[PDB]
């Protein structure tokens, strides 16, 4: 028998454009990120790796504009918007930039640049 081997994160694209002069990939369409009890969506995603030894993946995405969505067991889902949104995988963390809105279960926040949790 043969088939799949591993799916640690699920990812889909409508249109990919690969850099045949170098290495970078442009993503376009409705790119999804699945990670635990959060998701992200964009048109634009870019993939970069600024350090080989420590396997240092990083991505970002925007234009949709990029949003968070979270589904919560206690019946309190949460979301937010930004002009820019980055996922520094090699730093365990996420940042919003430009007109960053987040709603928490308690209140909302709206500003320049806002930190987010996994």
């Amino acid at each position: 028998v043969t088939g799949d081997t591993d799916q640690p994160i699920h990812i889909e694209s409508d249109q990919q454009s690969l850099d045949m002069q170098g290495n970078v990939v442009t993503f376009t369409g409705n790119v999804i990120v699945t990670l635990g009890t959060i998701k992200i969506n964009a048109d634009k995603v870019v993939v970069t790796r600024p350090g080989g030894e420590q396997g240092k993946e990083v991505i970002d995405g925007y234009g949709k504009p990029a949003t968070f969505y979270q589904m919560q067991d206690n019946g309190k889902p949460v979301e937010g918007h930004a002009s820019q949104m980055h996922y520094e995988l090699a730093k365990d963390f996420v940042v919003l930039t430009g007109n960053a809105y987040l709603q928490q279960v308690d209140s909302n926040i709206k500003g320049d640049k806002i930190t987010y949790l996994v």
Binding site: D6, Q7, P8, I11, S13, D14, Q15, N30, V47
Partner: peptide, 16 residues
């Protein structure tokens, strides 16, 4: 393993 993804064009999926 490398990055892998499905496509709304190809239907079949691929590695990067």
């Amino acid at each position: 393993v490398p990055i892998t993804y499905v496509n709304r064009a190809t239907x079949k999926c691929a590695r990067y």
